[PDB]
Structure 1
Amino acid sequence: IGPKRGSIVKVLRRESYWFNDTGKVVAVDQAPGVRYPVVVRFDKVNYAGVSTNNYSPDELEQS
């Protein structure tokens, strides 16, 4: 599943720090039952200092 590994996606999740921000997909989990399989890496950190977050494919579009 997922759009593609190594692709550029835009986050549609409202409560994330990287909403409407360009991110790079580093891992998509193909195991069933995982709610947020797509792991997206960002060039900028959030207030917690991390750049790695998991999103569903419904919360991302290819840009």
Structure 2
Amino acid sequence: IGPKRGSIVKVLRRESYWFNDTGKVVAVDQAPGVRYPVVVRFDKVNYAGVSTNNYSPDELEQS
């Protein structure tokens, strides 16, 4: 599943720090039952200092 590994996606999740921000997909989990399989890496950190977050494919579009 997922759009593609190594692709550029835009986050549609409202409560994330990287909403409407360009991110790079580093891992998509193909195991069933995982709610947020797509792991997206960002060039900028959030207030917690991390750049790695998991999103569903419904919360991302290819840009």
TM-score, normalised relative to structure 1 = 1.00
> Post-superposition shift, 1:56?
0.0
Following the alignment from structure 1 to structure 2, what is the Cα–Cα distance between the partners of residues 60 and 23?
10
Q: Secondary structure at the match of 2:34?
A: coil
Note the residue ranges of structure 2 that are not aligned, 5 or more in a row. Answer: none
> Post-superposition shift, 1:44?
0.0
- CA deviation digits over 1:13-57, x for unaligned, max 9? 000000000000000000000000000000000000000000000
Deviating above 6 A after TM superposition, structure 1's stretches of 4 or more consecutive aligned residues are none
Following the alignment from structure 1 to structure 2, what is the Cα–Cα distance between the partners of residues 59 and 15?
11
State the Cα RMSD in Å. Answer: 0.0
Q: Look up the match of 1:30.
A: 30
Following the alignment from structure 1 to structure 2, what is the Cα–Cα distance between the partners of residues 50 and 15?
15
Q: Look up the match of 2:50.
A: 50
